[model samples]
Target: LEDSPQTRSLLGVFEEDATAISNYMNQLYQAMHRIYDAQNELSAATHLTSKLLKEYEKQRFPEVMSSTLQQFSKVIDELSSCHAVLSTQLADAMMFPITQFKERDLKEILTLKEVFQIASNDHDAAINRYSRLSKKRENDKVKYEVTEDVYTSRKKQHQTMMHYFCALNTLQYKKKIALLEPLLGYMQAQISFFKMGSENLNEQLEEFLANIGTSVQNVRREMDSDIETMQQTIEDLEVASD
Candidate 1:
């Protein structure tokens, strides 16, 4: 966003980036959706596992086994809650940004593009009419009328082009936010999940994974600082605009 040019007007390039963002966001949504689905299914199936265990000895097994089943059920139930929280956060924070970008910013640009083209076409047709009138040696009255039409059409076309360019520039700022929010949500959700699990399971829960868990935490910390700074910059821009 810092790199946004002050004097750029490449509508095609903007549209191309919009398409790329749309495709990438869609793919990311699908993958995260798959993850959420699998988590839900696992939570369901694990519930069934404990359900059977409880049924068998309400005592198809020893007291030890029965007690073990109950505790496992409790742990599984809590983990299921973790999954539930993450799933909801993914839907709200991660998915919403991308969907809004598709339905709003991307659509805005395309809609503006269509109107611009229509205005351009109208201008072209007006020019052609004015040309035919000139060559045919039409009456001064009719020629003057066609000339006025061409002038009006050209004025409309350029005005629409200017409006379209404004929308395109705004879109560049929006695209950055749209892309960043989801990843921020993902990282935050994951870090929170691990922290939640470690608290319930044991302090050693994170320690057991050693490097992998530490790396995730480190990455989360680094990104969180950056995302916050990015958020502040966005607010500054909004204030400046106001």
Candidate 2:
């Protein structure tokens, strides 16, 4: 990058690659954020499901219904531990790296590009103004002042451009890590989550945890499901173009 004409000629290509990197990286970030938000909502809503089941204790319900509750809360709590484990792993492994790239690296480059563009415009405007002055008619003072303006503007543009290029070049390398690490972490988390869930599910159910049996395993999976179901209004009305 700091070398000869061959490398300098490829600057536009380098710039184009950077644009592609940032565009895709942002899309990945948006997708990851959706996953994170879904996780939080999922965990809390699931916790509420277990919480609601605990609330199901003999609250004026028929004896059959109340007895059906059958102390499901204990099983729900242990399973809920899986949710926490999954969340922690997903957050630390999956969420953190993407956020770090977006917040720190990507954001910094955008600001750098903006400032560099402004500096470019400043340089061009200075050149334009200097070129418009009729050299034959110009006074010494006017020529000196405009010449100095050109010098200052060119200096600013050069410095800003170097900073911008350095960032873009750094980004070309960084984007690989920004993507690969987070995804690997995400995959690892998924693998572990399923393994844990399967292990828990594989537990021998003949063992009595407060008299809840495997045949009648009391599970209350609600709230999360409720949120999906409770969303629409019963509007018995016809719709028309009008």
Candidate 3:
């Protein structure tokens, strides 16, 4: 039996959607990787800062304490900038596909277009903020005034770390899982419907789906591990303070 015109149109649209989704997924993966690298760098910086703090507590050296604080602040700023960019990209990737799929009526399409425009504006704002912060870091002077408020400083540090962790957790893994689960099922259904005579097409579709599945799963697991590590680090810091 031949496919109806409506069915064919729907399939065509979905094929385009699938391709777009795949492209967005690839972009998201790149963003996630960059965020992961930044997190690793920040973690190392945190370790160094912790060591510096211990030494400062023992020796009460103003220069060493100030230098460590300055470096710690720089790393925090870097983490913030990375988080801003990654969050913007992840939000765009999450919303754009939903917007495209909801373009059923002229009014709905117009509304979605407006939403996309707003998101685009917000993304630019984030970019600007990140740029400004980076510039500030480059020009900021390091000072040697020892402030005895380690508790407040550590509180701010914990807050900053949590902010980045939350954004990374949600965007890197949870959102991807939400996107992939249904997508995998849909792809499976499509594969099942393909005519069985062409081995090449069948193999290609299977392989493509399998790759997507594997990539998403691997990323999810990695993010989970990272989240656990961050949690442990937070706990360790708290314990040290006590």
Look at candidate 1 and give me any clashing residue pairs: none
Runs of candidate 1 exceeding 4 Å displacement: 1-9, 16-30, 39-64, 203-242
The TM-score that candidate 1 achieves is 0.69
TM-score of every prediction relative to native? 0.69, 0.75, 0.24
Show the lowest summed lDDT stretch of 10 residues, model 3: 140-149
> Which candidate number would show the highest TM-score if scored against the true structure?
2
- Encode model 2's per-residue lDDT on 114-225: one tens digit a residue: 9988998999999998989844686799999989999999889878877887888888778999999999999998888778867766445335443454334434345456
User: What local lDDT score does residue 151 receive in model 3, on the 0 to 100 scale?
Assistant: 35
**Top-scoring candidate (lDDT):** 2
Model 3 per-residue lDDT at 106? 23
lDDT to native, each model: 0.75, 0.77, 0.48
RMSD of each predicted structure: 23.4, 12.4, 32.8
lDDT of 3 by residue, 1-242 (tens): 14335543554454355445546755654564464466446556655655554454466435544664554455444444444443444334443443333233223333433554554455555545555555543432321111223334444443443343333333344345645653454344334323222333456557755866786798899999999999999999999998
Who is ahead in TM-score, 1 or 3?
1
Rank all candidate structures by their lDDT, best first, as comma-separated numbers: 2, 1, 3
**In model 2, which residue pairs have backbone atoms overlapping below 3 Å?**
none
